[PDB]
Amino acid sequence: MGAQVSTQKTGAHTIHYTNINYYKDAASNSANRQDFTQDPSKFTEPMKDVMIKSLPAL
Amino acid sequence: YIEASQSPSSLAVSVGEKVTMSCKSSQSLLYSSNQKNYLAWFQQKPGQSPKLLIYWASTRESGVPDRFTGSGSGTDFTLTISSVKAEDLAVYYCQQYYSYPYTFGGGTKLKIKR
Amino acid sequence: GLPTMLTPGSNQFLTSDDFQSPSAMPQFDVTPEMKIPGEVHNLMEIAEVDSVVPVNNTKENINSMEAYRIPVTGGDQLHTQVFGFQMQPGLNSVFKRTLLGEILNYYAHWSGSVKLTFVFCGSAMATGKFLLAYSPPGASPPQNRKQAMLGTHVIWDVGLQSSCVLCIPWISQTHYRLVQQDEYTSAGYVTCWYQTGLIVPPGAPPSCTILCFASACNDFSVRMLRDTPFIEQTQLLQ
Amino acid sequence: DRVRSITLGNSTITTQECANVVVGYGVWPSYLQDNEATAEDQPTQPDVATCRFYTLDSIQWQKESDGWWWKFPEALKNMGLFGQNMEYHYLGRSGYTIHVQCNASKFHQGCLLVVCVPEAEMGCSDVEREVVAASLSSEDTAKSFSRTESNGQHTVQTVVYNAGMGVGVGNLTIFPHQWINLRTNNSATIVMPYINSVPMDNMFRHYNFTLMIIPFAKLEYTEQASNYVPITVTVAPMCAEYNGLRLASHQ
Amino acid sequence: EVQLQQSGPELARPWASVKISCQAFYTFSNYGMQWVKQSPGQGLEWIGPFYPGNADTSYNQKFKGKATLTADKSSSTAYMQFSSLTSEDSAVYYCARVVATTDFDYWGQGTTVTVSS
Amino acid sequence: AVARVADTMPTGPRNTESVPALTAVETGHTSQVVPGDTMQTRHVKNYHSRTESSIENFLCRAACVYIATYKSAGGTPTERYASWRINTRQMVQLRRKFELFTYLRFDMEITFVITSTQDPGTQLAQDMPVLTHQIMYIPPGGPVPNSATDFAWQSSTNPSIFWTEGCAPARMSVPFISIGNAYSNFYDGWSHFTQEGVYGFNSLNNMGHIYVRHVNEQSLGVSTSTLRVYFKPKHVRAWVPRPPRLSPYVKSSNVNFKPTAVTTERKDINDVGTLRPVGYTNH
Ligand SMILES: CCCCCCCCCCCCC/C=C/[C@H](O)[C@H](N)CO
């Protein structure tokens, strides 16, 4: 019984759920909806030299 | 083409009484920002150039006597005179300057009934 | 066997559920994943990227690059308005097609601050000062600089650095707004005026242009995924 | 600081009024590791003979100019030993350094956007047809966008504001990009890593990325100033390697 | 004071589009002036504005293409360009000026055209 | 929490030589300013989150990709079964959603919704048992059926669904079955090495075929069935985002388009949705 108890998505003003995998292939699992990584620095600051807001751009 | 029409075509009101001209538009001429009504009243006699009498539909041009008094708002405007003179035979125009193209009123003649 | 009981919602297909399902290709050997640059983890990584905003989108300019250029002239321009538009990032002809409005159009609720970067593309000898104002709702749009200075304004002095940022903040009575904006969730107006004026030496072109970029701040959020009202078809594509 | 010097191979580039250097999606080019390798033969690495600065032909910026695009690496077929290695090998892999350079004056004005679009698939001028090879890129010379539509048969739909790909040109800033503002800049440098979904690909039937230069503020000047303003592109391969040696293609 | 002296009689044959002219007694910056067509068989109508201090010009939709405006900054005189002069174009054309954003502060005397042939 | 948006730190009045409102976009750098840098602000604790804008939450929603029809009785055997070469370019909505990104890699969940009806004409059934349908997926290379009653339907190795009406829609899961390390939504290249043949993404599309038929023979009347295919991408990874499309789609194998306007027109550059009389803003 490799039952996994995770946490439920609730408002950030009984909050846990269980999960068991029934199939031998990882393609059969449910979705990875609770992976909330983000790193926008590759599109917004793709600069060779760092830039500070306070300092002049040039 | 906004139409600031007038009714009636004429009154033939006698000298020494009151008269109330009217002008009805097809679209409101009140600017909700500065609270101004964009209508002017003009006086035109046969032979000479017309003269402005009222601007903003409620304020009188300098050099005009107190007999003319403008009133009304929104779409409907009026011009009241308390005692006309026999020299006032003319066609008065309610000219709009709200938008393009500039459209003048239909006028109103003054006939002879005394 | 074990006594069970079927509840409502059985044998239905809801297009937004998370259930497991058998694999059609058991023990399939998936090809290794390598490192490909530029991975996206969140759509707000895209809305936070500057995009050129077609402020000058009149009848003739939508079919050219003239839609992207805001003209400025150096006479006595103290009574003229450079530009002015409603603040509606999702439902507005100025914003709805940019890299931000396109993302907001697949969502029904948005909330956050918005950056507007203005870039002076004149000559290096042209100098001027502008007033970039934001006016919250509740009153009529400003008609002149004397009226527009009473809102959240920035005085931009064109010099060695060419870009100036006007940050429209979050001022609303509700936490979120509607992308399909209405009279109840209005967000105000954004206007520009001449502070002093554009002055050039003898030799430089007397008229210049400005470019506008719009992005989202680090507190922008969207919710309620919907379809975008931008793409449609009549029959199956073949 | 506004001065920069980029030295690659036996070539150096000196700029005195640059903005900065943009590095792809935050990653610098590098060689293929053994983890991600698929081809088993030993690759070749002519680091100096290949990874140097090659100068494409110059173009003129006119007042009515709309834009230009090159496609890589097909713009470097006949350029040094890079083209020879492209011809003699089956698989190639490299990043690039792109230096666009244009100096006008303190009395000129204008603004160019310089983008490097990966997989910039283009549409035909005549829908219900398909483009030909000659209509996408001819040589190191540029392909010019148009102010209005193109009524060709097998040509690219070169209307400027759809950028050839059928999208909004103003959003082209999602890709690695820079702006040349004659007020501020006289150069634009972009370092592009190798972007693909395969570890290597044939360099003759694949266009890794398209370099597009587009004026958003048209060139304007007075009658007293120099009216000829050239734009020059200079591209340097970086960390280039090849597999699959056999006889030369195109002979 | 600010009398807008117009041009003299310009009666002629049709297809002889005449440039009607008016003078001014005010600075030619930040004001506007218009021409209005007066014939007692047509009431009053409007043609097009010229706006000194803003450098722009509109036209009446019925008179689009028919009429054109232009002014000279150092001449203190504005005239009309006309096209396809007809017999029905007989009217006492006027001149008016704008002191404020709108309204006509002054009027011209009124020059009439008698298209006869 | 994860992943809550940033807070607005309280800021007051200042008079400094460090101005962050002025930047330079000529470097290809999006300004990282916040509202506190241009005005006085208050401390608000922002509890908003970006959970619904993630890629896995943006794309993991089933969308139709194909609608096919096939008859059950007879006449012109080609009409007795349906076939489809697997695409994502036949329905514009999911096509644009996928085309937001240059490269994708995900597992798929495939749902089939089959709805039948009774065809008109003489000699109707007036009573018939439930219909059983077969969906068979043929990888690139395998034999393809030429009729409803064909030997190729045994599917000794090709996966198949036998689905009976009155039940839930058929469903399965499929791994990342591509040849390369990601799905290529775009391809600026050719099929041949001499730069000729097929241009665009159509060359890399080698996924297989899907055929669908009626298991029943019927033989008393005619019944027409329609199959709708729904795709749900899960475990999604995306690379190199692109601008969303402007022009309407035309072909399912090209990126061909017609030039469209960038946006919608408005009356003036100072238009704010008001009647806007004449003067100092409108002439
Ligand atoms: C009854 C068995 C049915 C089995 C169906 C399996 C089909 C699996 C293919 C679907 C998954 C990939 C679909 C292709 C996606 C797009 O075309 C790529 N992004 C472009 O190549």
Residue numbers in the entry:
A (entry chain 4): 1 to 13, 24 to 68
B (entry chain L): 1 to 114
C (entry chain 3): 1 to 238
D (entry chain 2): 11 to 261
E (entry chain H): 2 to 118
F (entry chain 1): 10 to 292
Copy out sentences from the published article reporting this entry, exactly as the authors wrote them:
Echovirus 3 (E3), a serotype of human enterovirus B (HEV-B), causes severe diseases in infants. Here, we determined the structures of E3 with a monoclonal antibody (MAb) 6D10 by cryo-EM to comprehensively understand the specificities and the immunological characteristic of this serotype. The results of our cryo-EM studies revealed 6D10 bound to three different types of E3 particles, the mature full (F-) particle, the intermediate altered (A-) particle, and the procapsid empty (E-) particle, resulting in three different maps with 2.8-, 3.2-, and 3.2-Å resolutions, respectively. According to the structure of the complex, the 6D10 attaches itself to the viral surface along the edges of the pentameric building blocks of the virus and adjacent to the twofold axes, a binding location similar to that of our recently reported antibody MAb 5G3.
The full particle, also referred to as F-particle, contained a significant amount of viral RNA. Therefore, it could be considered a representative of the mature virus. The variable domains of 6D10 recognized two epitopes of the E3 F-particle, including the C-terminus of VP1 (residues L284, P286, V287, Y289, and H292) and the EF loop of VP3 (residues S140 and Q143) at the interface. The MAb 6D10 displayed high binding affinity to E3 with a KD value of 0.13 nM as measured by surface plasmon resonance (SPR). Furthermore, it also showed a potent neutralizing activity against E3 with a Neut50 (50% neutralizing concentration) value of ~ 0.65 nM.
